Amino acid sequence: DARRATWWSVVNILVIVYALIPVLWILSLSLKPTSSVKDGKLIPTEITFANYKAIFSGDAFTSALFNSIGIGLITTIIAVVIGGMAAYAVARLQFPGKQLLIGVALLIAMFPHISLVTPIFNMWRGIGLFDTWPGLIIPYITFALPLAIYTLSAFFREIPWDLEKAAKMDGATPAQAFRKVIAPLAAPGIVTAAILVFIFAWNDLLLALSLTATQRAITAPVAIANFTGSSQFEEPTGSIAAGAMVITIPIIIFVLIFQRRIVAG
Amino acid sequence: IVINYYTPANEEATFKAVANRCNEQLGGRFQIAQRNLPKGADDQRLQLARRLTGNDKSLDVMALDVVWTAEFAEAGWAVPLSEDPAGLAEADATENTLPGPLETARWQDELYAAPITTNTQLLWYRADLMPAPPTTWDGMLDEANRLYREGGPSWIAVQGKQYEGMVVWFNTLLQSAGGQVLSDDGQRVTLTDTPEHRAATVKALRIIKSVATAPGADPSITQTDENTARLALEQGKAALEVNWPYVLPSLLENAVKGGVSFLPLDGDPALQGSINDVGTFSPTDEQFDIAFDASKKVFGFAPYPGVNPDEPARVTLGGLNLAVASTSQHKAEAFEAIRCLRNVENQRYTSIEGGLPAVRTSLYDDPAFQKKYPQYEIIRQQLTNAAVRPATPVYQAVSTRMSATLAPISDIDPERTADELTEAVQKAIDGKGLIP
Amino acid sequence: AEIVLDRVTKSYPDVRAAVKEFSMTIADGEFIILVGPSGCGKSTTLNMIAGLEEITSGELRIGGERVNEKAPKDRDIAMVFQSYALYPHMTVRQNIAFPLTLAKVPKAEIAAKVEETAKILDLSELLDRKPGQLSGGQRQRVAMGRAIVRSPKAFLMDQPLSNLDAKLRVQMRAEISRLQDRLGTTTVYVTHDQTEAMTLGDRVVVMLAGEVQQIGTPDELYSSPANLFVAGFIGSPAMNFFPATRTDVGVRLPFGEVTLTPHMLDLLDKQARPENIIVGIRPEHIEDSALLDGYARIRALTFSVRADIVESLGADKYVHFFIARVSADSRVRTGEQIELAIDTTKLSIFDAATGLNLTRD
Amino acid sequence: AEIVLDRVTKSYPDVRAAVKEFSMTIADGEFIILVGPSGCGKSTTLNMIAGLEEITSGELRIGGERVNEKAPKDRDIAMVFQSYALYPHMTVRQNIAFPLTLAKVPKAEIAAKVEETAKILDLSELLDRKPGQLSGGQRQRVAMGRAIVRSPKAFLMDQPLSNLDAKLRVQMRAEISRLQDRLGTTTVYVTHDQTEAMTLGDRVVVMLAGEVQQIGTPDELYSSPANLFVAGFIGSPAMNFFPATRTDVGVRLPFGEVTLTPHMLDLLDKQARPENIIVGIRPEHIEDSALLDGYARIRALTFSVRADIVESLGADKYVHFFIARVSADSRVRTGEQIELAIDTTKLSIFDAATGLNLTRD
Amino acid sequence: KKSERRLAFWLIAPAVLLMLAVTAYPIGYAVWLSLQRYNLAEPHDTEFIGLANYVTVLTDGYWWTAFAVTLGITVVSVAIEFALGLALALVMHRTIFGKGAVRTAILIPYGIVTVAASYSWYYAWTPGTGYLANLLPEGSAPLTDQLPSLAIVVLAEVWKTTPFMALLLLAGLALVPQDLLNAAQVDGAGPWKRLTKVILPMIKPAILVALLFRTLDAFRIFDNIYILTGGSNDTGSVSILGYDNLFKAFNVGLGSAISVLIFLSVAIIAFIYIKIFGAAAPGS
């Protein structure tokens, strides 16, 4: 019905612009000339690259970016590999207390990280470590795993084991060709989990402040969280905005291409 | 070997410029890696405190804002300067120094941190929007009311935010009114011990409350700092401000690319190519002169305004002192750095062209220096009655506790709030109750 | 190879026997139907036949080898699941080449055998649509595709034809029989369709409550159901039953009396004399008394009942009132009055206290 | 009220027809069957009757209104829908209480309505579990009663007995008919199986490929198939068609020639002279020539073709040669030679160049 | 059978071992530090405290108001983010447009760096410069006042929080075959009543688990309020308060007590979402 199609069309276009407007305000602010930034008008007149050039010049962002992407990727793989070893037990199998095993797993990712910040500094996380990739990785893993398990559990309920019964009819061996179809069955779940947990992990600010040390062992969130313009004498905002746009976009353009298997998940 | 030096963010460009200028000399002995801390004072204090107490061996040297030396010395963090492998760094300290910054360098018993820069508050006004500034808080309100009634740039740009710059402004009023926070031995509050002290404080509290509650004021004055202050005047919203010198090179450099709407600068043929790469203003003598004389008729400056119009104001000081990282695995070279960076070839540069006042006294005697820094007279005479701070290891807790009870600035009961302050600082002297 | 279950039971704590100790030898290359109601452990027996399940009591041997708990890949068999699971994440040709690729033939030979299979099984033309893009009957026929490429020693399968029209289904069943013949294959199907059961089974096993009610030919079970329950189970419509009483010469009925044939009175005299009998009558044994030949007029009991319902089936009237499947040559209609005729030879009798077939050979 | 599908048609993009203007009406309180192949459009038609599918063209009228676009609440009709849905996260009883809760009846009235409702359709003995505990056939019968309770202006019902054994199926069929009688309510059952259809419908509509192939009573369709498609669809086993040619006396066959009845000759001579004929004959009319009386020997052709196989099914010997379905009273055996007999009265003529029933009234 | 139990435990063993190590011993140490009376400036002289660490906090109005403001923010943010996210999930499901467009639209605000969001809103609401502040009548001063500033930060965090749980609820309807909804609106036509009175029963753990999690995520706040205020307008979060006592003042005796009672303050609401509402895991 064309009336209801207009009603669709308006809600479709309004909701996307609602989602997008903050980034427009950010981006436009970073393009507008120094003189014009104080103007209340959204209109991006008389654009300049100078802020962006002032980010690209000097390693200030790019170092902490290279930190961030490494710690993200490695934190992803180790969480999901441990996750995928365990998910079978809870969501293809049964064992005593398994309902309480998930009963804690759903909780123990989502802690108020402020409670956990202080002991690790006072432990060998700030003592036996501090300026080190392991020192920051260990807490990321602490929050990654129970999400990985929780999400993988859903992504294992959605598959009946009946196909493996037919598999032991066409050949009864453990792993081998059975792994060579059960892994193809599982793989879309693995990558959907790997995406969401990467993004979540990359999304921390607290420990990313409270234990990180220098351009070796500082992540990009911490960098932009303390960066304050490449000139002291210009208002920092245009540079801050240019850096913010620059650092939030790359993960966005990555994950949006990869949306398929997580929108399936 | 190379040596990590941590700056404030608000003034790092100057430091890396001289870090280059000394590293080229230092060559194959060692080099200094400039590193950085936040713009907000307590933030750079706590970020560093984290860096230190995380027991990092790789940070090598620091510049503490002095008010953060009592606690460090009490904590045995850094060293009394006599522990130097060279020793005579304690005899590059003293020497040409002004005495107030050296008073800052000295704790109970020893000296602990080599003074390297200092400030005290200057008054600023648009000399094109008024003749003869009011030099008084009362006259400040009255003239701001003139501009407001005229529909002009009525704002007054004092640093209103719940961080210690506000408490510093307050302390400059209290000591200008002749009150003080504690006994000199920091052992018991004194700001309401006697009706003269109450009067001195409650007068300042009325001034603070009457400030911002004046009509046509900056609505968001309640959250501001020196930069927002400077910028608001450059944006022609304010006409009065009470801060420090950096302001001048900030005006000059801003105007050379844009800056004040009311003065071109960047369109001037003499100013073309004045600013170097890395954005710095870097003027010729004449580019300085023409920017200066153009600015002189636009923005005027004065000594800090008086609570009593007949009495010169007890203006508060601030600054930095250098110190060796007590964690550093090598440190004779840190004292060697401390010496050559306190050296006048750096010191003169950092005031004239870094904008920040160096403590080496003979520098003001150069007419070249004096000419490029004319406020030096106002500084120099402000030194000799300068208001100090209570100087205790508990000072951060005390000051922040004050700032917390001060937060409803326009809205305090001037009388009752003094009791609140005294009780808050009493618990701060006690070292008890949560950081709010 | 021959297969031999004896006393074979599956039991679960509930304790409950899901199969109550079944027994049968099945000859090499034989075709069998398993049958019963639903809830008759059929799904249990599938796992047990495969040696996937556990012989909680009794024993299974095949080719003389014990195989009770020996997993399905040990037995050189193939099978098809009732709700037709078949290999996802690959298209049709890939999915059915896969077990043939486990059978590790040369890739070209696998593709050639599968291409033959695409003509032979012919569930569709070779679409290679993704597994979910096809409908359920086609998947079922593709799971049969998986079974044909295996050319095993033995087979087991459950109700595929239920997903299809009965002609295409019976064609598929006949194609399956040609396969089982050509492949000489020890075979069972499980089938509630008694028509497709009877046309495929060399021998039917009939079950209720997990126990064997009989084993035999469909013609045996049609002619001679072991008891009053299985006499109700066999055929469609089921046998009519009436409570009727022994006479010294036969039985007195709700609608008359019949002298029992002397040869059958002999068995009724080797037996006890039950007072009351479920006398069983074939619906198709019953006709309009006007249609008869002279021998039928002479030999039949004939008696009148209201034709309360007359279902019309083209070839017959299912006169319901009890259900007489008279021929459609009778012009009789719903609620009309009629004389029905019955052949004595098409009766059966079961003692009413026990359900045991008195008329049994 | 009556319902009227005036040229109602559907097309959807791959635009292609799912229904090519199929047309019908159902009289007030009538029982209809729809029947046809899978994907022949019936699922369309019921979605179209609901006014929930887009009626791409034509005119559904009911009770004096055109209603193609009306929502189900406005329509005041129900589906006993094929998915057999009744609520998990709810009781069996609450699934049947849902419509009654929409009807928002007084609780005592509701309990009484449920009491009658669940005495009806009683697939569990009012077990009233969470429905996920029950068997699929039980659920089906439950969903049946669950839809049945509301007595709306009309009902549509979707091959529900497919989920069930035939015995209980025919019991539920009779119950279903008694329900529609008691309701006197405009009704259609839908199936792919003509054996269900011929007993259930006051009038059947048949479809192929989104189009109606005929409408009439079951015995109208059986007596008088509109085309060679519906002639092939009706009956079980389906009608034999053999290649044949015209003669002035009647016809020539694969094995002889036959005289045609004078009125059929007259109609055949009002018709063209076709080059090829399908002689349509129900296989059950064919017999062993040993079985005939003198009247049948006058009325019948007799001729010999080999019984290449003989299945026997208690009713008939399914003589393969094609099929020839003699009574099982003939003792003929698999692979024998035989003489077949057929009543010359019974042969339908289809012109094999067009598929029209030349013998049709 | 002992074997298959044993192999299940062997697959669990690494994960549970380290999962204990990275939390339980830190927590045990944290409560022992709450027995301690300590400062990092003078760590050695750590006597016991006679429950006094806890006594200070439960004595303190700053703690209670910091508690209360997080309770206020969390409940309302939960309520609105749920209310929005439900509609968002339904439109992301049933749009007639190319669904990858709406899928793209919703993922980015879920994915964007929370600090950048914090800045963007903070600037949007800075008066004069910030367009959203600038359009108001004059003297409104949005950042200067508690309830306005709180309302704004709720209105800021929603643009990061709800898109995630809308995605969660999207999987929360991927578990529902759409033909079941069709079967519901068969008879039950009128989808305002229909879609509600079916989804209300139908969403067993699809929504529940999407309420408690978002709730504790919100309670985990230590960011937007902080950068937006430093706790001024008395807008101090319990997270900011924890940081304040530690990095400004180094009273680990208080800060550990605060940490653990915050851990109790999650434990009670988690326990409620086990003992109450059913609230069992989705595999139950």
Ligand SMILES: Nc1ncnc2c1ncn2[C@@H]1O[C@H](COP(=O)(O)OP(=O)(O)OP(=O)(O)O)[C@@H](O)[C@H]1O
């Ligand atoms: N874990 C178990 N506990 C108890 N009983 C079990 C268990 N596993 C299987 N069974 C038994 O096996 C039977 C499984 O169903 P059954 O063998 O009757 O096939 P069915 O599916 O009911 O028949 P149809 O194929 O006609 O639907 C149940 O009757 C049950 O008693």
Ligand SMILES: Nc1ncnc2c1ncn2[C@@H]1O[C@H](COP(=O)(O)OP(=O)(O)OP(=O)(O)O)[C@@H](O)[C@H]1O
């Ligand atoms: N979204 C769609 N796009 C294109 N064609 C469609 C769509 N939905 C339905 N159709 C058409 O409708 C038909 C599917 O419905 P139809 O009822 O004919 O099949 P069915 O469900 O197997 O019917 P039945 O099961 O009653 O035999 C297809 O042939 C198709 O062309």
Ligand SMILES: OC[C@H]1O[C@H](O[C@H]2O[C@H](CO)[C@@H](O)[C@H](O)[C@H]2O)[C@H](O)[C@@H](O)[C@@H]1O
């Ligand atoms: O002189 C340049 C320095 O100015 C700031 O520090 C001074 O002003 C603060 C008040 O805002 C005082 O607390 C402090 O004691 C002063 O040193 C600025 O924070 C520094 O980064 C500059 O170096």
